[model samples]
Target: KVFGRCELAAAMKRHGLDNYRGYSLGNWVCAAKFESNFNTQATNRNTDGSTDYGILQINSRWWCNDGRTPGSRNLCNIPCSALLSSDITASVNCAKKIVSDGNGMNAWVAWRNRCKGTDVQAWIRGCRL
Candidate 1:
């Protein structure tokens, strides 16, 4: 049920690599770190459940595009976000698109520069396929 390929991962893999390598994961990790701090169980009360989920902290409203009230029961669920709650493939693929602005991972690498004394880069650099 976990660690296997997920729909999001399949979608990303089928969708082809971002224009630049490593950008996808960089962006994903950035979003994950920035939003949820890589916490999959995170859920915000202020958002009323309408925004962000899982480690990548994807805004389900934007992704699911449901017209219902934010976090309402009518809100359509994003399978990708659900998958990210436990699936590694989905999380990795989600990260892949976070930095598709050409040479993608450059942004992540730059972020690493700012954190020169930390192990962020070392951890992220090793997060490759």
Candidate 2:
């Protein structure tokens, strides 16, 4: 695990994620919360047999390779285990690339289902940023 909600928000702000590609920090925070509860070591097996990795729960079918999984696009060109580290640098970079690809936070199903029209401000509320 990497952060509590406030800590994650502050780190996101420091990383300039507050307005990256016009996506709000709140959106990112909410998405991350739902995706992994701010845990970097998080992983989940999807019903499709693909897996989600890291703090953002990046999908193996499209983002990173888990080796056991065949046909991964591996757009991030890194092992899925790398994202499980406490250091978030690579994960953040990959997430930025994903957002830049025009998916925005929509790439994360949790964001679309849980955060998309909700009061996202509460995600970052009381955080010192």
Candidate 3:
């Protein structure tokens, strides 16, 4: 399922990403834009042979269990397959765990590269509630 702009924001807000860990709803919205374009089943390959999964494109290296990532920590305690669901709550929960590890949202370089230095609020503008 591909989430539209404000659709993604509304979903994230519903999942409690608003003001989470000092990151605003727009910060998350922006990250999702560049990371996975709100693609519920997006998967990416990493240099370390790890994979990124779902809308957040969470890494398999330290977040999810793909059953193949060499040093997977599975910190999110979920199978990477879980991230592909359209529900999105699992991916959102994994993202929370990633940021809470003290790395914050910088864990996703896409976020650091774009949302960090930009006016991320633009991502959420005109989205009612």
Taking the tens digit of each residue's C-alpha lDDT, what string does model 2 give over 1-129?
668988888887888888899888999899999999899999898788798888899988888888877678888889888889887877888899888777778899999999999999998888788
Q: Return the TM-score for each candidate structure.
A: 0.43, 0.92, 0.96
Score candidate 3 by TM-score against the native.
0.96
Output the lDDT of residue 29, model 1.
37
Give the top-scoring candidate (lDDT): 3
Candidate 2 similarity to native, TM-score: 0.92
Full-model lDDT, candidate 3: 0.91
Give the range where candidate 1 is weakest over 10 consecutive residues by summed lDDT.
1-10
Give the per-residue lDDT digits (tens) of candidate 1, residues 28-53. 33434555555566654344546544
Q: Candidate 1 at 22: error in angstroms?
A: 6.7
Model 3 poorest 10 in a row by lDDT: 97-106
Over 4 Å off, model 2: none
Estimate every model's Cα lDDT from 0 to 1.
0.42, 0.87, 0.91
Residue 20's lDDT in candidate 1:
35
Off by over 4 Å in 1: 1-27, 47-49, 65-77, 80-84, 91-129
